[PDB]
Design a protein around this nucleic acid. Structure first.
Ligand SMILES: [Mg+2]
Lengths: 306, 317, 318, 305
RNA sequence: GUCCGCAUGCCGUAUCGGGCCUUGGGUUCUAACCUGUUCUGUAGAUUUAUGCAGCGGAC
RNA sequence: AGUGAUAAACCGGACAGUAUCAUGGACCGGUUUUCCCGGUAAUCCGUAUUUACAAGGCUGGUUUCACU
DNA sequence: TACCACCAAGCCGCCTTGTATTATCCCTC
DNA sequence: AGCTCATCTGTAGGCCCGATGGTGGTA
DNA sequence: GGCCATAAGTCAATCTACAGATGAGCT
DNA sequence: GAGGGATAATACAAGATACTGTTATGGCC
């Protein structure tokens, strides 16, 4: 006795499809609102559905309320990468693509694949990643305006210089807001110190790594976390968080250039005859693994191991 | 019930059994009559009485082993290679640049539980073989036709000699097809029904029989249209993603190829065709769009007329 | 007597290649600095070169000072579209040494084609376009931060809301700076009112149009200004077989093309003469965006027409 | 001197004359033996007895009119169409029509002053035609060979019957080519020089001679390498594919089996070059050495390499 | 010999940007008609090849 | 930077192909959403040959070596 | 003790002209 | 003075150029 | 003097949902 | 009454798997 539910999410609506143990489908549309989420739970209890595994494609942040609602209702929620769903639909031989089809396709995804259960991240983890991605957003905007000074007309410059001062201030404000967040929590304070002990990783990179690694050891292996960033070869897969991947490139250079263990790594690969960026790609992968390793070890970085 | 996947190749087979408990027995074999008997014996050795084998439709290299296991007394499924690739990509994020392993096909078989494959009737195999040979030589004839336009004088003897040969051969095959369909009383009758449709003649009917077959495999005419890849492909999500509808093309190309000129003959110089054309033309559709739609219609009517078992009735349209 | 010079510009260094009437070359590289620009002029006068036609590629802000320098030093300066430059290099050979267009190639471009002479913009024209493109940059960033509010985390919202305020303030400030520019000059003040008289054009669109049309009427026909914005269809007819389909060329300033879209949408919807234009097109098998693309072209063409006429918009003419 | 630009079509012509004073004169003609005789007369109508005519290398529809005007007494230039298009994009940014292109070729002619086109010798034209036909039948013979691999048994009589026909025809042309060569004393000797190179045999010698021709129409051997599209820009590939493809198998036979070829392979292998990069390099070399050997007029000498 | 450890070797070309240039074609002929699908964006998801080598532990 | 010489050295990833596979979204009656059952030669959603085919064109960069 | 300067840097053919298929209807020997 | 509401499949080319972060080494 | 093997054989993340602009008539 | 010729359509994009031949020469018989 286990139902398999599939929810295709939109901004406004929720298309739901319940696959019963007998094999027949029940479907109903709902509003993607706090009210319409309570309507969904009531409609499941209406049909006497107590145990169910619910599958839902990671679709912006429109699925996040209902995923947490159904988790709290006491169901098994799985939030799948939508690339998998796309591939599954093709494997299921489906020609047309509609919302009703997708909700059914997700129900069958749930039954066949039996995906891993989804856990809502800790409030601190959610806060930290929010600040970190906001910080990258301002940096990008600061870089836009900093490029413009190069070829700016003299009537444009007062505006550009003014904007740069604002952006530089706001950037510092967040950096403190981040520091306050990690310093308050005893665990994050300690874990961040461990990351900064790695030569090549500083204030900025340590925050990014904590945002994606989290409080607890959610990864079982170092190579898993490296793969999660899209750093493991397939050429690099690039099948992982781009914000995590981009944050490691400049750490990789200062490591391979101005550290002992970095130059040691650089020279070894240089000997075998690797190009500059190939070595950097490799060092990005290594920094990721070492970062996860240092945290699980729970003791400062030790160069002797490398 | 065990689940087996076979990664077929020209020279080697690669086999992966999945036991009910969940352990993998694996062995490679030669893709030969000997190595097919080795497989059956190896399966029978490990006390594998009932199993569901899944094979990719790679080509003619997988056909003997599929027949061997069918005879041995197993459930053989022969899957569209695109489904296998898509399945591998649904199993992981980074399986794009990877082969579909025998293990993957066993998992495919367990999860999907695909339909059982049936070997075609020897007569159906012969017909489809002749029909695609006929298409092959038409293409070659067309090549040489195009060459006559801009030929040099020293080349023309060679091109003209080839054209004679190709026309003689095309004519020989057309008789060999006619003799095949006439000899069998079922095909003779079913062909006559297809030709009753206005827009469908001697060549198209042979192509339709080659893919419809003796038995009525398709439950609904809709499905035979989908089989040819002639149905539109909807692409809709939320209130933003709005992909324009287009011909799916996810079906037999040999079929889809054969229906275009019929569609053009239908919509142009036929009562029921013009009627269809005008209605869509009024609704504001392009010329080639109307043909694409008529192609789907002909396929759908072709199966409909056979399913009825009576000649084409214009009143129904 | 007339020499043909080509200058291949870079950030730091100039690369000059004189072509003599006889056919021999003179080559000398210079620094791309105020000193090196005066050094260039002296060097040309050194070799008794008073009459010459200089050809430079339009690569941005590194080639502007030297183009000014030579124009003032009494020479015919042509500033060519780099797309023309590359196409010329490919017409000279099939397997060219490099894909780059060197100074020698530019000297040759100048000789064979005798391109049109480049006139330096008026300080006010150059200032107005500077402010207008700055305004469009801040509008883009404002739109970025607007989109973010939709899906923002609550810890992020204070930062986004704060930025939006700054951007909105800056945009108001900059719009006033534009208004004060045009209202000071009696020429620009008059021309702006003539533009705004057109239904579907207001304060923002008028400034963009003035920025690209300028003080004087450089275009002979109004169709040419529509082409300058990249709003004219692109035909691809060849022989009998090769017949494609007409789409917008988009071969022109994006700043103009982006500025006219919402005006066109206002015109066809609310204004009488626009609605009239929409309907006649809509009668034929013409889709919504196709009508907008058409109205965009029309608005540009009317915008120029009105300024050339020198009298406010008159609905009777449409 | 007048600058005339002919835009060619299957049926019609679009002539555009540009006078020294700088005024256009347009007049259409039919692309026929009659309409070519009209053109000659109409030019002499406006007292044009000395002009440079520019026309795109467009199919074979411009071959008669080019031969006509060459015989009439004009400087005919037949330009690569890729150049023409590039020139059109250098003049403007917009629109592509027949009326534009006819006028455009007059401007091309004036500014560029392109090299004069010379009609091939009948034998050069015949040999090329046979060699081109021979490739067409080889490509068809391969199709039917591939088809035997996976053929059904009812198809197999048809495929085998076709192969026999194709093999008979290939053998026939190879003789027709050999007869053409052995008759002409020049081609007979020229081909013998080509075959003397280790790595070039019956097949390749005919292909090379088809594109080199009777006269030494290239100044240097490195020019002929460029004409095949074998020179690095990665290979440009800006040349005859028929000439290019013919050298790949000779290149393998050279680098693998011949003494001078192995030497070449080894030297690049020492520097650390990939398999196909060495083949790419040897293709260029065979082309260069082929032309060199003909210039010399002396059988291949290994010493030089 | 098997299984399990690994911040190990082998494999690895990051992510974002900025500025500037653009003087149609046909017609009943240039503020007319025919021909015309703007310019930019935003957010989220991603758990090993441990595949093969080493090195270590347990039985 | 020209001109002449070059069968040398450096720079070099050719072309053409073949076979095979493919059971719509839905609509119309029941049930009283879908699912499921029955029906579909009708209506709405369709730019064929998941690459249609043919012919033609293509006069190197540099380093040595001479002469300006 | 706060401030400055490096650290890495790949992409791979273009053009111009043409035409066939099949089945049904209409015209001529 | 303020608010709504008009469009919905995707497809121009070229040339000049810069930032990121975290060390070890300066003033 | 007629047959037969055989030399060569790189590629550049994937998805899923979403939004703004400007100017004129209306409120 | 039967056989041959002409016309209908025109912007293009977007699925997978398995596989082969070319030529010329030094090896064989
Ligand atoms: Mg969805």
């Amino acid at each position: 006795e286990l139902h398999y539910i599939g929810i295709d999410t939109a901004k406004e609506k929720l298309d739901v499809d319940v696959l019963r143990p007998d094999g027949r489908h029940r479907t109903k549309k709902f509003a993607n609102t706090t009210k319409g989420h309570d309507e969904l739970v009531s409609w499941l209890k209406g049909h006497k559905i107590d145990h169910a595994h619910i599958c839902i494609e990671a679709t912006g942040t429109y699925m996040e309320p209902v995923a947490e609602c159904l988790y709290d209702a006491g169901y098994i929620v799985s939030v799948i990468n939508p690339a998998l769903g796309k591939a599954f639909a093709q494997s299921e031989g489906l020609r047309n693509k509609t919302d009703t089809v997708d909700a059914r396709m997700l129900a069958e995804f749930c039954r066949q694949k039996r995906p891993a259960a989804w856990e809502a991240p800790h409030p601190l983890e959610r806060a930290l990643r929010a600040l970190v991605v906001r910080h990258q957003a301002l940096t990008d905007m600061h870089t836009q305006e900093l490029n413009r000074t190069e070829t700016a007309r003299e009537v444009q410059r007062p505006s550009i210089d003014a904007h740069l001062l604002w952006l530089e201030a706001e950037l510092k404000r967040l950096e403190k807001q981040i520091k306050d967040l990690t310093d308050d929590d005893p665990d994050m304070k300690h874990r961040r110190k461990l990351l900064e002990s790695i030569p090549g990783i500083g204030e900025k990179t340590s925050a990014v790594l904590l945002a994606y690694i989290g409080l607890k050891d959610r990864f079982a292996h170092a190579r898993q976390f490296a793969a999660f960033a899209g750093l493991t070869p397939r050429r690099m897969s690039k099948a992982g968080h781009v914000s995590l991947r981009r944050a490691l490139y400049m750490p990789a250079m200062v490591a391979t250039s101005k550290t002992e263990w970095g130059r040691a790594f650089r020279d070894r690969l240089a000997a075998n005859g690797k190009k500059g960026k190939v070595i950097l790609g490799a060092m990005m992968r290594k920094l990721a693994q070492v970062a996860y390793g240092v945290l699980k070890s729970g003791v400062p970085f030790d160069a002797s191991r490398h």
